Design a protein around this ligand. Sequence first.
Ligand SMILES: O=C(NCC1CCOCC1)[C@H](Nc1ccc2c(c1)CNC2)c1cc(Cl)cc2[nH]ncc12
Lengths: 38, 155
Amino acid sequence: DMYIERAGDITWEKDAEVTGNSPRLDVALDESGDFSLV
Amino acid sequence: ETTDGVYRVMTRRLLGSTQVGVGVMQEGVFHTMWHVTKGAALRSGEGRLDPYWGDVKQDLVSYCGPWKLDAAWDGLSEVQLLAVPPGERAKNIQTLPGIFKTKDGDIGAVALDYPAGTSGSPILDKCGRVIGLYGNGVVIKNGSYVSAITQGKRE
Ligand SMILES: O=C(NCC1CCOCC1)[C@H](Nc1ccc2c(c1)CNC2)c1cc(Cl)cc2[nH]ncc12
């Protein structure tokens, strides 16, 4: 059986770790909800 | 517990207590990714959550009521992933999304590498609104994971 525990509030925190890139990818979504690169 | 906020999705079927995913409780409705729960009922303390809506292709599922998240990424602003990693405290990571160009239109993409058990973590806009859920995406050349910004439809 599965269960849930609270992890926190949903708010935007100022001065948070700013990391990550913005790639532009060509992808395909199949019938099983799976993405794959084109 | 029907309290608004982000939640951990846990299981006791595997070794010890394993985190399989994450979800959002808003307006008495629990939202997560289909691949996390497979549509199975959830336990919330003494209480229980039954599924209400789901779609394998959209990889989404809502519990106790219809999908409630209607905010969308504006295509310009930086967003924040509220990542809840297994065994770790919830953490806000600010990023500028990329794009998933598909045959049916474009959708935002967050390029943040996190363990599988973090699938279902909300992506937020500057007003603190949930614009989508992280955890359905693809692995690219350098082995880095790029998730889509998965959002459902609100009636
Ligand atoms: O988005 C994902 N991509 C993996 C493949 C899942 C199926 O083929 C294409 C990519 C992972 N979740 C997932 C697992 C099964 C299914 C779905 C999504 C939706 N369909 C079924 C995941 C999510 C996260 Cl947060 C960190 C991760 N690291 N490695 C994997 C992975």
